[PDB]
Design a protein around this nucleic acid. Sequence first.
RNA 1: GGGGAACCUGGGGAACUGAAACAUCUCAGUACCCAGAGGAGAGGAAAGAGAAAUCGACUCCCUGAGUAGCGGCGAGCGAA
RNA 2: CUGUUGGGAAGCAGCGCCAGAGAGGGUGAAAGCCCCGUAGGCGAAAGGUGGGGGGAUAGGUGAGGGUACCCGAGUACCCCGUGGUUCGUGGAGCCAUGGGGGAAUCUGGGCGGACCACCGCCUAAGGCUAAGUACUCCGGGUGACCGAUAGCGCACCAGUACCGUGAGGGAAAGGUGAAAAGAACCCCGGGAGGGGAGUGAAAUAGAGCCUGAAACCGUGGGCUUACAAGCAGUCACGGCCCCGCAAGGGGUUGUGGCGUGCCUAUUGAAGCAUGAGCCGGCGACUCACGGUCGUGGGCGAGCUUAAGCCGUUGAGGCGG
RNA 3: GGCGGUAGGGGAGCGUUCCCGAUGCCGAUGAAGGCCGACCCGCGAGGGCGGCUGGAGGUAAGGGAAGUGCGAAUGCCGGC
RNA 4: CCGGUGAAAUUGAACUGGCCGUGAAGAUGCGGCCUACCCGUGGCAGGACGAAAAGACCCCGUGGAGCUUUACUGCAGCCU
Lengths: 146, 117, 202, 63
Amino acid sequence: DLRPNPGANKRRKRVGRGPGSGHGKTATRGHKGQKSRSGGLKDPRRFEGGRSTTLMRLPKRGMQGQVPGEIKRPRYQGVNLKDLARFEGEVTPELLVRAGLLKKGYRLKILGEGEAKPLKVVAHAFSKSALEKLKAAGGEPVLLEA
Amino acid sequence: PRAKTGVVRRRKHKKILKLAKGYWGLRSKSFRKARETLFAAGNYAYAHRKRRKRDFRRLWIVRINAACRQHGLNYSTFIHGLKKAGIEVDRKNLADLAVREPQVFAELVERAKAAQG
Amino acid sequence: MYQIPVLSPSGRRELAADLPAEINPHLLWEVVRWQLAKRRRGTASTKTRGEVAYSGRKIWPQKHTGRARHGDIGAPIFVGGGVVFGPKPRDYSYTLPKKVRKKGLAMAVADRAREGKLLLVEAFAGVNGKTKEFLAWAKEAGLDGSESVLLVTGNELVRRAARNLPWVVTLAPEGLNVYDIVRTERLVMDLDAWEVFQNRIG
Amino acid sequence: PKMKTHKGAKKRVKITASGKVVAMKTGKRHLNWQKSGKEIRQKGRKFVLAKPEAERIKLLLPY
RNA sequence: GGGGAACCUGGGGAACUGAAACAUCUCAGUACCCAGAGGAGAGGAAAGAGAAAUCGACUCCCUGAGUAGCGGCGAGCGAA
RNA sequence: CUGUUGGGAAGCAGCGCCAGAGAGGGUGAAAGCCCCGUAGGCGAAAGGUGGGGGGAUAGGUGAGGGUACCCGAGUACCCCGUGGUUCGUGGAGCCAUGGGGGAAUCUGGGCGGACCACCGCCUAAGGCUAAGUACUCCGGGUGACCGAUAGCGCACCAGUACCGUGAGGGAAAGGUGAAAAGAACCCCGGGAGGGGAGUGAAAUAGAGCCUGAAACCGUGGGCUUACAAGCAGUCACGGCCCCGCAAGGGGUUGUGGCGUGCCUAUUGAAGCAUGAGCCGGCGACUCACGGUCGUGGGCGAGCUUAAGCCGUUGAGGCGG
RNA sequence: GGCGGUAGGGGAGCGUUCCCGAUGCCGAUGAAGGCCGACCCGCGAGGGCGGCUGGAGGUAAGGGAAGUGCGAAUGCCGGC
RNA sequence: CCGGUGAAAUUGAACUGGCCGUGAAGAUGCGGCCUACCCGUGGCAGGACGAAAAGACCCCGUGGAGCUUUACUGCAGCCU
Ligand SMILES: [Mg+2]
Ligand SMILES: [Mg+2]
Ligand SMILES: [Mg+2]
Ligand SMILES: [Mg+2]
Ligand SMILES: [Mg+2]
Ligand SMILES: [Mg+2]
Ligand SMILES: [Mg+2]
Ligand SMILES: [Mg+2]
Ligand SMILES: [Mg+2]
Ligand SMILES: [Mg+2]
Ligand SMILES: [Mg+2]
Ligand SMILES: [Mg+2]
Ligand SMILES: [Mg+2]
Ligand SMILES: [Mg+2]
Ligand SMILES: [Mg+2]
Ligand SMILES: [Mg+2]
Ligand SMILES: [Mg+2]
């Protein structure tokens, strides 16, 4: 293809809205008409009316914070073995991040659904009702400790 | 990339002048006056192009009425016979044969006094 | 597609291409644009009613005045005051995914192969610096000034031998800008390129 | 720039996993001088809503 | 000793505005006044960080992160 | 180089040349090869710089055992007000402290969010320290930046004229022609201003001298008007003058048909509700970041970078 | 079969300024702009054509970016 | 009245009659009817609801500002 004639496809050009005209868009600039319109209508999300919002809900969802804030206990993240059959061997968190899971959430636990290739998976924990689902396969050593 | 007005705003005011030709005083040289009286025209011309028939629709009848009453009968009594004769011809204009040879129309009259009396 | 020409130091032979040869222009169209906005140096500006030198003082009271109502003279309704929504300086660049230019690099190269408008080279009567020491090389190779040409080589001598060529634009082995490729109507490159272009994809 | 979440809504609401929004039920720490023991049950359980949840969704969004 | 377009450190320091009223809060230690340091200013070699019987002066960009948290827990504020 | 239109050639045609220089600007119009210059290369007696190299000097260079010497004072620490850290007294630490109580020398002293025990980090109350970082009066390069109502307020004798006592406010205004070659001279006339001749390619380029619109004023010509009731127009026919080939067309209007200006707010107009004397220019949904939906393209259990690092200088690649 | 239409929604287009298209082309045998016209295309906003003036720039087809389209705001400047 | 010099507010535009009705219902401007040659000049002020400074009046605004207080909170000051 030469330099010109490489136009776009279709359904993609901008032609944005130009509401300063005389029969295209209206002489009130689109979504305006009544009044109280030049700056803003406050935030139509959490507010407006001036009644009581809908913040009238109760926030029991506790442990809403202290002072030093969060605390460093490790995030246990699980992983469904459905695609653990994509590979095989002494699979370790070391590469499970390289595959496309965990992502330094760290502390890998295995669980899930499906046939498991008797592939000996080393991790930090295993779901019981899946561990016998592994017991009919191979071997599963545990993490270091805590 | 600035894009001043320039050509655009003038040429338009020249077109309104172009249609405001012969309009009294400021109504043809002052722009936003010429804009106005053009609004009424296109409206005045609209309605009247709907009206020009009713004008002639009326005129024809009087001439017709002028003719029938020169035989001795009214327009109301004239038309019925023609209609009784079932003659979807008479375009109320084409009944202008009162100075376009009359016997052609004078003997349309007697073909009316038939089917009614 | 598969087949490509080469001017060896010992004759005219060919080679087999490892290169996908499908097409999608809305990719290239969506790549040229990137190359062209990223080279846009952000410079345009006007001045809002704050960067204007006029003061901030009402011109005449609105009550009991006869005229209208007004204020400071930076007001865009006046004249010479402030700009409305002027074009303060800003970047136009972004971050187009590499997988669009990588594939976008390949697509265009086969486009010249698909039309034959290609040539890998290796032999040069112009391995030194002279514009005359090249145009005869083009004569003995097949470039008669009819149509444009992009050139790639890792030798800063041949560039000299054509950097003054209106129909031949210089290009280092690396920035194979899809702009200049599609810009020029024919392409030339070397192995010194066809190892990095290969290390990109190949 | 960089939208600020609404911690006054985080502490109150939890975003589901089908996009729905669910809050604890209202009316359980004031009116309880003995009224319907029935009521102290369908108010200790979470409930979902309708239109206004999208008014809430947009108050979160990075979370 | 005084000057210097803006940049920098310290001494003082608002109110409009927002909260669709308004006092805590915000605007904000901003604008403005003062003194001073130069081509830069300030900081700068742990009585540090923060959880590993670990990092190693200080500044600066990115991410962490609008996380943790702060809030008439309301507007909204905002780390390491 | 020549030839040919052209007032003028760089234009057009032919025949060539340079190229590490074909980026630009100027020359009577559009020049790679007429001019300055660009590619590339050489360069200061003097001042400064120094950030790269070198010399010198400042400074610095061992261990084991014992000793019972010293390790920064109204300081540490505690309380009463207080500020900073996201900490609005909150469970409220830590850092600094205005007031009060007031230690100790490694058998010591602070900290790890009240407090205590253990465990770990630190050794305060003396100071200094380049680099990496911000800015643009200044210089350079650059521009999908403007082009005399725009761009800073000033392209120009502008922070002037002008206003105000005063701080302070603060404009308007560019364009003959390539060359003044700028009208000798004659005539009307007091001059100004004009006629002619002349220069000039052009004076219909005349010194507020490129273009010259619109409002506004006047002269000439075609149609009309002194029995007529009007948002000033529309429709029909005839009439007058003009263009044109049959036929048709332009401009005007005498008569007849109908006809309650524009915008805005208003339930509501013709309106005694707002607004505009007119004309011409400036003038009003863009941008940054985050996010919902839609769509176009890339990959697809993956998708993707940010600051930053190598390189021509309108090239990209790494960077997970 | 439907097509009166305000707020409002969707779709489609015309014009301006600038960039790729360009070391390209049109331009002294006259460009942009300004006076006309009863010619032509378009229902349109608009685009071409003949005449006059002006005197040096202007840029197609396909893409891109906007300081983008005026009849009023007792809008502002200037002129009348 | 003649010679000379020569503004203003106002103004959408005008070819601006009366009467009896209608009409958001005060009509030169709509309907009907009556009157009226074109154009000035001197003067009188009934109409054009006349020009408004955004009426000297009333109301609205979660406007402003001055003043009052055993309205609220704080501050100086004073006692302690
Ligand atoms: Mg627009
Ligand atoms: Mg509409
Ligand atoms: Mg409003
Ligand atoms: Mg509500
Ligand atoms: Mg399981
Ligand atoms: Mg009929
Ligand atoms: Mg007859
Ligand atoms: Mg495409
Ligand atoms: Mg005032
Ligand atoms: Mg000749
Ligand atoms: Mg100016
Ligand atoms: Mg300025
Ligand atoms: Mg001015
Ligand atoms: Mg105008
Ligand atoms: Mg132009
Ligand atoms: Mg009158
Ligand atoms: Mg009061």
